[PDB]
Write an enzyme that holds these catalytic residues in place. Structure first.
Site, PDB file in Angstrom:
ATOM      1  N   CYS D  76      42.868  17.101  55.438  1.00  0.00           N
ATOM      2  CA  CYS D  76      41.495  17.603  55.483  1.00  0.00           C
ATOM      3  C   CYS D  76      41.528  19.014  56.060  1.00  0.00           C
ATOM      4  O   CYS D  76      42.213  19.271  57.052  1.00  0.00           O
ATOM      5  CB  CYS D  76      40.579  16.701  56.316  1.00  0.00           C
ATOM      6  SG  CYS D  76      40.960  16.626  58.072  1.00  0.00           S
ATOM      7  N   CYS D 147      40.962  11.397  60.204  1.00  0.00           N
ATOM      8  CA  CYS D 147      40.113  12.118  61.157  1.00  0.00           C
ATOM      9  C   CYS D 147      38.898  11.271  61.557  1.00  0.00           C
ATOM     10  O   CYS D 147      38.235  11.554  62.559  1.00  0.00           O
ATOM     11  CB  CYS D 147      39.680  13.482  60.601  1.00  0.00           C
ATOM     12  SG  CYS D 147      38.608  13.396  59.179  1.00  0.00           S
TER      13      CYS D 147
END
Ligand SMILES: Nc1nc2c([nH]c(=O)n2[C@H]2C[C@H](O)[C@@H](COP(=O)(O)OP(=O)(O)OP(=O)(O)O)O2)c(=O)[nH]1
Ligand SMILES: Nc1nc2c([nH]c(=O)n2[C@H]2C[C@H](O)[C@@H](COP(=O)(O)OP(=O)(O)OP(=O)(O)O)O2)c(=O)[nH]1
Ligand SMILES: Nc1nc2c([nH]c(=O)n2[C@H]2C[C@H](O)[C@@H](COP(=O)(O)OP(=O)(O)OP(=O)(O)O)O2)c(=O)[nH]1
Ligand SMILES: Nc1nc2c([nH]c(=O)n2[C@H]2C[C@H](O)[C@@H](COP(=O)(O)OP(=O)(O)OP(=O)(O)O)O2)c(=O)[nH]1
Ligand SMILES: Nc1nc2c([nH]c(=O)n2[C@H]2C[C@H](O)[C@@H](COP(=O)(O)OP(=O)(O)OP(=O)(O)O)O2)c(=O)[nH]1
Ligand SMILES: Nc1nc2c([nH]c(=O)n2[C@H]2C[C@H](O)[C@@H](COP(=O)(O)OP(=O)(O)OP(=O)(O)O)O2)c(=O)[nH]1
Ligand SMILES: [Zn+2]
Ligand SMILES: [Zn+2]
Ligand SMILES: [Zn+2]
Ligand SMILES: [Zn+2]
Ligand SMILES: [Zn+2]
Ligand SMILES: [Zn+2]
Ligand SMILES: [Zn+2]
Ligand SMILES: [Zn+2]
Lengths: 184, 185, 185, 184, 185, 185, 185, 185, 185, 185
Positions: D76, D147
């Site tokens: 990400c 995350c």
């Protein structure tokens, strides 16, 4: 249990956390909460002899009887949050067997209290021991604890196993292994 | 305490070295996000076992094994700085004292939130429990997948690794070990 | 080094003999593709264990068994030159040294990318680990399906084959072997 | 990519978080991390024409081709943490089909970059569109984000689905439904 | 049909070029086994549809579609000469004629036992059924895994490919096709 | 802010009214633990949508639906003050703006950490997303089990409840709704 | 060997006695199909163990157990002439010689394609393997469902029968038999 | 009706022709067992729909579809006299009259205990229900596995066949048929 | 045997006392249906073991244990006259005699179709097998769910009970019993 | 109020007529147990919808469908007085009013604890909800297994029955009904 007092405590609890006891969705909440807790703690007020009734019959054989998957619900004495799962019971009779449903009634008697999963397993086992005086008894409790899931550590995949082994279930390794294998 | 400012500077430079644009919209807050993330991911080094347990040690209710399974964990392999994660299963036999169930999870996180090797993670968790409770024995099994093996290098997709640590009666009593391991199946 | 030019020539003639047209659009680059594929599928013969391990041997963190399971593998049966594949599970107890997890997969590939018999594959992987780590013991279980049994011959569809190799304590200690095998269930 | 510079940055990163680059387990870490990131960002340096090679063949029919379960791994752009899962591709040819493996090579080209799952789906679809000029293309990406799992909200059961529909996959509701049904 | 002697000679040399020893005990009969195997694996080129069906065409019993699913198939990709396999699902609405169930499998094998591309395999199976019977429509779905994608090249492990061919009402009416496809889920 | 001292006093009295001993070892710290737990369980009332989102709104990358499924949640039913929990699935079609994935989870927790009715929880989550992104449409599905139905009263064990909220194109476009719901199956 | 003509005549008379019309369209070629069918289903009586195994006996690669599981089989109960089927699992420890994997399936078919009793099937398969390899021991487990008790008689639906045969170390050594049986789990 | 004596004689001759010993211990009572077996397996030809349904036709409780799924069945293929079995799923919308649930199973057995073709089985079951209840529509789906293509011939292992019959609103109304088929999923 | 007229009269009055109308269309034939049902459900009391076995005792083929698992059973608890059902698993080691597989099911039904207690049911089944055959040992495991615990009283939904009876070597040798039990997992 | 004394007398005579001994230890309290059980199992006739709902009707929070699935139920078939059980799934769209979730279960029990036919059970539950909430629509799906089909009569083991009732928009809007049914898959 004084339902009226529980209601008053519940009404104030609602206010302190920032809610409005007067709004429609909470009007009957103090009453509902009071009755729920009377039920959830009914185990303290039950008697083992009444719970078993007289459902103790002559043993039909000498082999182990296993009653597994008895779902249970309790409240942790530490956070007053629910912990639930299943209780698995195994025993070898000594001339007497118990009516199957009474095992569930015994589970409920000790579960409907403020508990510690480690204690719950022991109390159930000791109750069955007192009622049947079998050669041995084994109780395994497996549960999930909301105090670990919805707050605090917030772990999602965990479950705890506790147990109690009495008589031949404690003394005979093969008997214990056979009981545990039946649960797998 | 971790120097977030330096971490941000290093992350900002990391972005340019790999060929990205540190100035583009989506990466502007990245150095800051990465810095905070790593401070959290390494917070385990700065924790104290005594504070983690919080004195949540109670009198034993019985003599049987207690098994706390499926405690999910996330760590970073010290070799590639890539995540490895899965579950930790703990088993122990009390010697007068039992631990609050959630503290097992807090101990796991304390050692997982560091740079690690799975073999060590199991040992440290087991030793921490042994120290806090002084039980008759303790067994810890860690099972995880390693991204350094999945998203790069050998790129194997079906592999999982099991490591463990057995102390006291769990190390010495064969049947006690077998019983613990059987509960996990 | 394999003679890719010669492999291409052989593959081109193979297409002719089986009844196909080497001139077809879809077969024009087949000899070249087949040559490169087989060079890769037999690359295991040209690898060195020392280079495959890459010195990724670290000090042991404990004395408990480490199990790396589900390492998918693909090989070619030496009897029919048809693929056989599945998974390799490795277990071992260190004697002061542990191996980087991915190296087990690299060792698996080194022996898998050759012409093989499943019984030998398990043995060579186990012996390789033994040589690299000199552990107290090591056990290897290979489970696979053979296309030479599925897409031809007996044409059985539900069959699977398990082979294994046990060294040191995995061979000498009954309980150790059982513990490893139980982890696989 | 300057591997030497990445190594220096990685060595200092280790120090700032409180670790010791000099201890045995971390000796080769800066080097390993540098090489890993060069591989993890190799997608930026690849060319679509080279990735596809020349594996574009004459269509054998007019029906939809579905290549599902192409596992992928990405990072990400927000936290530089891995997000991974599977990519499912569907298309209806217009005289040309792609070699099956090239779909995976295209997935890897865009995944081995700093990404946003929403972008990944679109870029893959547009790449296939440019290479085959099919009647339509549909790409579905389903992944889990570390995350969200190992930090921050720390949710464990979540997974995200993003997609991109081009040509007849966007215009024809039945075609899209048929593609999505194949994935169920 | 196919020259087994030439295949054997080609296979024997193949063993040498890739780095093996044709003289090895385990490889002595390999050239022979490989030649016979490929003769069987390409037998589809030499089969006749009329003989495959064996006149097993009976009068229709109803108007509803007949779905024969899960017919396992094994083929070889013409690009790499590596196996690709899975299942073939067939659906059709008769027009006075129904086929013997097993004949669908025989038709599948006839086209699968050749060098193929999955997209073509589906089309040829459907066209064969369309020729034998004169149904209102036929639908064929082929789902398979490709070893050329799994054991080499991209080495993706979770992927599978679906190809299909729709004829008659299966192509014409979306509801008929949708109903056929729903039966497969 | 919540008055922890008063909560502790109320909890201490609760223990005596139900028939327990507030003075026994295991219940001594309970009033304190319960007070802190409830402050956390109702923290959602004191949160701000603007702070929860943290400006993590980015430019849309495409026009297709984004589906964030399986966001686990835990709440307390306002009727019995007993937990109800499960998962929240969110789907939306951007109108120039997409939301950071984790913010969906933060929004869920903001509305779940309150006294609730599942029907409302779905609506509030959907309205919060609509306000933050002003998307073409948003759909929220909540599926949960209610302990007030399981551990007391009717004591049903197999029941689960689904509630939802559809806004914009999700409420008006039948196919858009069907597509979202199909992703959840 | 088998007089197909005589079987056709018998099958033709069978059709009329049970109440069917042998002259009916769909039954015209039935007596012929049934004749060839039973010739195939009883071909095991005419096979020779030496030819079935061929020369596929190779030198042992190691001393560990080899397990070939899931070999599907089909047989006919000698009591009702109705099919019974399932899978055969084979395990053995070599004594210098290993068998070609597919030969196990060929041996299974040799004894399965006869009129049988499941208890006998397991014994015959084990003896055949013992005779061919003279290993340290062989273990055979047969698990099947019997149509004679499913489609008639007691009409039980959930029942499965397991029979086995243990020779050599598989009969003698308790741990060896256990290890073999554990692999099947 | 069925001449059991004649069947015994035929079965006795069948045993010798295939190569078995009719005088063998385990085959002595076989011709007798087979005779009674086939009499039972073909009893469907001798049953009457009126007696099978009995008087179990009750007034409709509503207008919604009633679905009776998973009715296991066993039959014999008229082509090979080998069993084919699976499940029958029935759906119907009443027109003032509903059938006793068990009667659906009795109707299935009536047509299943005959020599059949799966396409016909579905049609006959549907017609029988239509005749007995005269509902707005009836839908029948038969799904089975055929031993004639599993234990012989093509020897395919993963295949299953679906046949169906739709009458009344189940044939006319697209949505009704879809709803019925969706219930089976 | 049983007076169906008295049962009908008792059932008709039962309907009245519980608050129903025997005159209702849906209850008109109920007393009759209930009487016949109970005659069938208690038919086990009137059966003879010798007739149940039907002389289906054959000579042993081997020495290994035979396991017949998954024999579904249905019974009535003598305490509440409510059904309890599940499966019965049987294991035995012959001593020159083996039983016809279906006869095990017939023995199960003989004892299940009575008023019972699960603990007794297991013992009676094992003793019957011990009498018919003269095996070295017999093991019977009964696993079932009890409606008297599910639809009334404690109303527990996830529970099931296991009872067993071990005779001969199954009681004597722990390894034999353990092996039998392992086959059931 | 039911006459328990009369039920006991009837049950005692029932024990005599079926062939049992009412004097047995285990049957002494059976008449009393049976009397109480049936009073509970038929308690639904003595309940009032108004009391069952208990005024737990709240203002709607939104306009979307609420689905309460998997409400387990137990009933007695009016035809044989044998249990039939499974689950009830409820869906509805509010018109300003929503029902307390547990009340759906209480309504299910009110109609389930009677003598029933599954077709009626679905209808009465739906009509009850309609009367209590006057929603835009309501749909009820009942799926169950019938012991009268399993432990006697046809003795089918795999069968399951689905019945339903659709009111208002659930009956009038095709898409609404499909949406509800899709939530159940
Ligand atoms: N052994 C055991 N511990 C339990 C049970 N139920 C239960 O809450 N506990 C533990 C969980 C906690 O670790 C402990 C109470 O910890 P504490 O006094 O520090 O309170 P806390 O709420 O701040 O702890 P935490 O949950 O946030 O970690 O009680 C149970 O059944 N057995
Ligand atoms: N035993 C063990 N090894 C680990 C762990 N995490 C981890 O990365 N490793 C291994 C994987 C690799 O084999 C090794 C590093 O190998 P290396 O120094 O040759 O570096 P590399 O990146 O080039 O290796 P590779 O992953 O490409 O095979 O560290 C762990 O928790 N335990
Ligand atoms: N739409 C989308 N959002 C993503 C992806 N990857 C990714 O991290 N995000 C989101 C997660 C976060 O909500 C957001 C960054 O939020 P932020 O700038 O407030 O940083 P943060 O680390 O403090 O956020 P958080 O994860 O703790 O909630 O980026 C992705 O692929 N798509
Ligand atoms: N559409 C389709 N493509 C196929 C089939 N079988 C098969 O190998 N292919 C593709 C995979 C490859 O992308 C292509 C050949 O690619 P290429 O000529 O560049 O050769 P390569 O071996 O170097 O390609 P790669 O597998 O390493 O990606 O053939 C099939 O059945 N259908
Ligand atoms: N629609 C809806 N109802 C809910 C939720 N949570 C929750 O407790 N309820 C219902 C369950 C009960 O039917 C109702 C309270 O019923 P009530 O005022 O008669 O109280 P009670 O405790 O005596 O009811 P009961 O649970 O014993 O049936 O609130 C929720 O999220 N949505
Ligand atoms: N051991 C054993 N007990 C059984 C069987 N079937 C059966 O009903 N029982 C038990 C369950 C009950 O505990 C007992 C009868 O208990 P009881 O005489 O107090 O009657 P009850 O209906 O009021 O009991 P309960 O079910 O409400 O707990 O019989 C069985 O097969 N084995
Ligand atoms: Zn707690
Ligand atoms: Zn690593
Ligand atoms: Zn992120
Ligand atoms: Zn290929
Ligand atoms: Zn509630
Ligand atoms: Zn038989
Ligand atoms: Zn046939
Ligand atoms: Zn009972």
């Amino acid at each position: 249990v004084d339902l009226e007092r529980l209601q008053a405590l519940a009404a104030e609890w609602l206010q302190v956390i920032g809610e409005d006891p007067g709004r429609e969705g909470l009007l009957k909440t103090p009453e509902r909460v009071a009755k729920a807790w009377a039920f959830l703690t009914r185990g303290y007020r039950q008697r083992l002899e009444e719970v078993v009734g007289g459902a103790v019959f002559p043993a039909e054989g000498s082999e182990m009887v296993v009653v597994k998957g008895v779902e249970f619900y309790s409240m942790c004495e530490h956070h007053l949050l629910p912990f639930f799962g299943k209780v698995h019971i195994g025993y070898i009779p000594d001339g007497k067997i118990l009516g199957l449903s009474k095992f569930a009634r015994i589970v409920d008697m000790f579960a409907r209290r403020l508990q510690v999963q480690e204690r719950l397993a022991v109390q159930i086992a000791e109750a069955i021991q007192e009622v049947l005086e079998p050669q041995g008894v084994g109780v395994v409790v497996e549960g999930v604890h909301l105090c670990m899931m919805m707050r605090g550590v917030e772990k999602q995949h965990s479950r705890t196993v506790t147990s109690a082994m009495l008589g031949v279930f404690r003394e005979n390794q093969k008997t214990r292994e056979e009981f545990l294998s039946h649960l797998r």
